[PDB]
Amino acid sequence: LQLQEQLQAETELCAEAEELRARLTAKKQELEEICHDLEARVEEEEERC
Amino acid sequence: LQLQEQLQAETELCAEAEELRARLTAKKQELEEICHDLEARVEEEEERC
């Protein structure tokens, strides 16, 4: 019962970490999309310049 | 005994997820630093305009 109770809290960490890790991928991709989108602005700004 | 081996695996499995999730912050920071640094480049480019 103690191992099951501790495993429940530990299992929730994996489910939470996995669900949170996937969320960080979107956040990283969102920030990565900003630099990628900003890269076009530099080229667009340089092209406009 | 199976729970002990499984509990240790969960702590190690969740550790990789937590480490991988925490590693995303460093990886996201790398891309986040690009967009942040690109802001100065986009701003310096717009400033040149």
| DSSP letters spanning B4-16 | HHHHHHHHHHHHH
Distance set, CA B2 to CA A3, A6, A32, B9 (Å):
10, 13, 43, 10
Neighbours of A37 (CB within 10 A): 12
- Looking at beta carbons, which residues of chain A come within 8 Å of B45? 41-42, 45-46, 49
Question: How far is it, in rounded angstroms, from Cα B11 to Cα B43?
Answer: 46
Residue A21 parent element (H or E): helix A2-48
Those residues with Cβ within 8 angstroms of residue B11's Cβ, 6 or more apart along the chain or in another chain: A10
Question: How far is it, in rounded angstroms, from Cα B19 to Cα A28?
Answer: 15
Method: cryo-EM
Which residue reads 């406009």 in tokens? A48
B24: nearest CA partner in chain A: A24
Question: How far is it, in rounded angstroms, from Cα B43 to Cα B37?
Answer: 10
Closest-CA distance, B32 to chain A, in angstroms, reads 5
Report CA A21 to chain centroid distance, whole Å.
6
Question: How far is it, in rounded angstroms, from Cα A2 to Cα A8?
Answer: 10
Question: How far is it, in rounded angstroms, from Cα B9 to Cα A2?
Answer: 16
- Looking at beta carbons, which residues of chain A come within 8 Å of B48? 45, 49
Question: How far is it, in rounded angstroms, from Cα B46 to Cα B7?
Answer: 56
Q: Do A31 and B35 touch (CB under 8 A)?
A: yes
Positive or negative: CA dihedral B20, B24, B25, B30:
positive
